[PDB]
């Protein structure tokens, strides 16, 4: 409804062991985006994730609706050619 | 109310004589801006 409060850029840091927190890339810009998709080409073994959301371009507040964490569990063509 | 449709960048061109249309600068990004302000340091005599 009011995405003027959407963060300008978000920086994701992951932790397989849950303590060593390492960045993944430069903060991806998110201003003016209705649907935030961050694809991971390589599926990452993660126990802890830190989301550093930066201040919006023309706002001092953050308005958020839902966080989804899409992944696979341990037991939940090109792969043979090599 | 719904600024998801706000343009990403605007490129302003002026014409003192109204025919020779020429750019002023690189398009300034504007996505996620509620108030679009372009300050002109040197005031410009523009007809178009």
Swiss-Prot record, chain B:
Residue span relative to the full protein: 3230 to 3277 of 4857
Entry text on domains: The BIR domain is essential for its anti-apoptotic function and is important for binding to DIABLO/SMAC and caspases.
Compartmental location: Golgi apparatus, trans-Golgi network membrane; Endosome; Cytoplasm, Cytoskeleton, Spindle pole; Cytoplasm, Cytoskeleton, Microtubule organizing center, Centrosome
Record-given protein name: Dual E2 ubiquitin-conjugating enzyme/E3 ubiquitin-protein ligase BIRC6
Highest taxon, organism lineage: Eukaryota
Summary of the tissues where the protein is detected: Expressed in brain cancer cells.
Post-translational modification: Ubiquitinated; mediated by RNF41 E3 ligase and leads to proteasomal degradation, impairing inhibition of apoptosis. Deubiquitinated by USP8/UBPY. Autoubiquitinated; mediated by E1 ubiquitin activating enzyme UBA6. Proteolytically cleaved. Acts as substrate for CASP3, CASP6, CASP7, CASP9 and HTRA2.
Family per record: Belongs to the BIRC6 family.
Function (record text): Anti-apoptotic protein known as inhibitor of apoptosis (IAP) which can regulate cell death by controlling caspases and by acting as an E3 ubiquitin-protein ligase. Unlike most IAPs, does not contain a RING domain and it is not a RING-type E3 ligase. Instead acts as a dual E2/E3 enzyme that combines ubiquitin conjugating (E2) and ubiquitin ligase (E3) activities in a single polypeptide. Ubiquitination is mediated by a non-canonical E1 ubiquitin activating enzyme UBA6.
Subunit: Homodimer; antiparallel. Interacts with RNF41. Interacts with DIABLO/SMAC, likely with higher affinity to SMAC dimer than SMAC monomer; this interaction blocks the substrate-binding site and inhibits the caspase inhibition activity of BIRC6. Interacts with KIF23/MKLP1, USP8/UBPY, BIRC5/survivin, MAP2K1/MEK1, RAB8A/RAB8, RAB11A/RAB11, PLK1, EXOC3/SEC6 and EXOC4/SEC8.
């Amino acid at each position: 409804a009011s995405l003027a409060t959407c963060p300008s850029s978000v920086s994701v840091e992951v932790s397989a062991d849950g303590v060593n927190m390492l960045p993944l890339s430069t903060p991806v810009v998110t201003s003016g985006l209705t649907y935030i998709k961050i694809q991971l080409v390589k599926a990452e073994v993660a126990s802890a994730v830190c989301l550093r959301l930066h201040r919006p371009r023309d706002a001092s507040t953050l308005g958020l609706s839902q966080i989804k964490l899409l992944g696979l569990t341990a037991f939940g063509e090109d792969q043979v050619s090599k």
